[PDB]
Design a protein around this ligand. Structure first.
Ligand SMILES: [Ca+2]
Ligand SMILES: [Ca+2]
Ligand SMILES: [Ca+2]
Ligand SMILES: [Ca+2]
Ligand SMILES: [Ca+2]
Ligand SMILES: [Ca+2]
Ligand SMILES: [Ca+2]
Ligand SMILES: [Ca+2]
Ligand SMILES: [Ca+2]
Ligand SMILES: [Ca+2]
Ligand SMILES: [Ca+2]
Ligand SMILES: [Ca+2]
Ligand SMILES: [Ca+2]
Ligand SMILES: [Ca+2]
Ligand SMILES: [Ca+2]
Ligand SMILES: [Ca+2]
Ligand SMILES: [Ca+2]
Ligand SMILES: [Ca+2]
Ligand SMILES: [Ca+2]
Ligand SMILES: [Ca+2]
Length: 92
RNA sequence: GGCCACCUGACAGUCCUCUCC
RNA sequence: GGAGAGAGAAGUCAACCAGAGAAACACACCAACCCAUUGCACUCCGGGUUGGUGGUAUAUUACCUGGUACGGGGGAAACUUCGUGGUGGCCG
């Protein structure tokens, strides 16, 4: 997609509990820039996926490039820019 | 006296309907 | 959301009333597995199995203790005793 503040991550290990997943995700993407929020749900349609909202688009980009395919909980991470702005960025 | 279905009724954390706030 | 009412599923129960009073079932939540899902969201929330926990279910229908209504005993009497849905079919 086109650059976005938020990156969409899928092909994540569905067995990891929400709290732990969000914490590890925060630990791995922290270095690219300030993270405004990380959204994760284990519902039928959202499981295996996560939305990491960066304060700066440039951070979404470096994070996406450097971490594409990163082995996370035994599965290579797939990353794309989110198709639309996350509410906090849009309502901003 | 027992066992199954069924009938009437008592009981009425889900759901539906109605009234009021 | 909340408060009433109707109906009523599941399940338990049976002469009626009252005091005590579980279980069953329904529902919700948690855990572990299994199945399904590769899904672009920002109003939580897939299914199944096993186990567990919970509620003005703080219910009421078993059971328990009192009386009430007919029946069977016994006793001068007083009174004291046991028993109390409809229907068909099948089991000695
Ligand atoms: Ca979780
Ligand atoms: Ca979740
Ligand atoms: Ca890790
Ligand atoms: Ca795996
Ligand atoms: Ca309710
Ligand atoms: Ca008001
Ligand atoms: Ca309210
Ligand atoms: Ca209410
Ligand atoms: Ca009713
Ligand atoms: Ca019934
Ligand atoms: Ca009671
Ligand atoms: Ca009780
Ligand atoms: Ca129970
Ligand atoms: Ca349940
Ligand atoms: Ca699974
Ligand atoms: Ca698909
Ligand atoms: Ca979208
Ligand atoms: Ca939205
Ligand atoms: Ca929600
Ligand atoms: Ca009798």
């Amino acid at each position: 997609t086109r650059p976005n503040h938020t990156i969409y991550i899928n092909n994540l290990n569905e067995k990891i509990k929400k709290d732990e997943l969000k914490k590890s995700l925060h630990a791995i993407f922290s270095r690219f820039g300030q993270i405004l929020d990380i959204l994760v749900s284990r519902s039928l349609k959202m499981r295996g996926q996560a939305f990491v909202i960066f304060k700066e688009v440039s951070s979404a980009t470096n994070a996406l490039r450097s971490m594409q395919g990163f082995p996370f909980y035994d599965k290579p991470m797939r990353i794309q820019y989110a198709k639309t702005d996350s509410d906090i960025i849009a309502k901003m």
